[PDB]
């Protein structure tokens, strides 16, 4: 996260760290959506252009964390993966269209002050909140700058951007399964997700029922926090039918 700040304790209890076993290192962010299901970006698990293709046994998920590198004894919980599900139409060849994956845990994680699931949006909450100018919140342990790494979880609030502005900011083909967010050069304020934040949540707090909803997944961006560029996020509601199908099935 670039130009963000230290998270408060328990601020983002759905935040998950995707952890490589060997060598032990941060792979990506992710989010807790139930006691056994974790949501992330497909490209965190599968990206052939970079020879990335992780299997279940390569990975751990670490839940309830604040510190990036510390083993947070009596606070974090570490879970093994039962199965990875990548969207069958995930487009790694071109533009990361449908950049979404589910991971089922081997055992349910116990909820605590530090561990708690985020809501997934209904059609109405999505229609109400996914509007240009409305701000969401992005969290992660990724790079502090484009070109080091934070001591603790970082947080930044960023406005959703008009789709024509998103489209005009890039040569990449944007799809309805994406949205972009961030400040314009003229707005003064800044901030962005960055490498290592991928798979983490873009959340919004509903003013109707005071619950946090995950609207986006950190997906891609050209550099980090560049003037005139924006962060792109997987549109969670647009892919919710697939999410439900997987959870109903498995």
């Amino acid at each position: 996260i670039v130009e963000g700040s230290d998270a408060e304790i328990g601020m983002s209890p759905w935040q998950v760290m995707l952890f490589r076993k060997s060598p032990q290192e941060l792979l990506c962010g992710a989010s807790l959506i139930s006691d056994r299901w974790v949501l992330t970006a497909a490209h965190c698990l599968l990206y052939p252009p970079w020879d990335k293709n992780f299997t279940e046994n390569d990975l751990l998920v670490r839940i309830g964390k604040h510190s990036r590198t510390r083993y947070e004894r009596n606070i974090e919980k570490i879970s093994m993966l039962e199965k990875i599900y990548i969207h069958p139409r995930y487009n790694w060849r071109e533009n990361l269209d449908r950049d979404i994956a589910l991971m089922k845990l081997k055992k349910p994680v116990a909820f605590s002050d530090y561990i708690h699931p985020v809501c997934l949006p209904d059609r109405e909450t999505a229609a109400s909140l996914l509007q240009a100018g409305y701000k969401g919140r992005v969290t992660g342990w990724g790079n502090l700058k484009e070109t080091g790494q934070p001591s603790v979880l970082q947080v930044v609030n960023l406005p959703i951007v008009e789709r024509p502005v998103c489209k005009d900011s890039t040569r990449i083909r944007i799809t309805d399964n994406m949205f972009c967010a961030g400040y314009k050069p003229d707005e003064g304020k800044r901030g962005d997700a960055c490498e290592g934040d991928s798979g983490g949540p873009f959340v919004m707090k509903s003013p109707f029922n005071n619950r946090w909803y995950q609207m986006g997944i950190v997906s891609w961006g050209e550099g980090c926090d560049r003037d005139g560029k924006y962060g792109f996020y997987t549109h969670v509601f647009r892919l919710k039918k697939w999410i439900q199908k997987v959870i109903d099935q498995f």
């Binding site: 328990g10 530090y114 699931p117 100018g133 701000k135 619950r211 909803y213």
Partner: peptide
Amino acid sequence: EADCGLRPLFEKKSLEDKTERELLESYI
């Protein structure tokens, strides 16, 4: 879950975090 999106250390205790008001103010 039925309890999703409500944080033990914030909503469940009626405490606000330091910047959630920034989000609310953006929601016209």
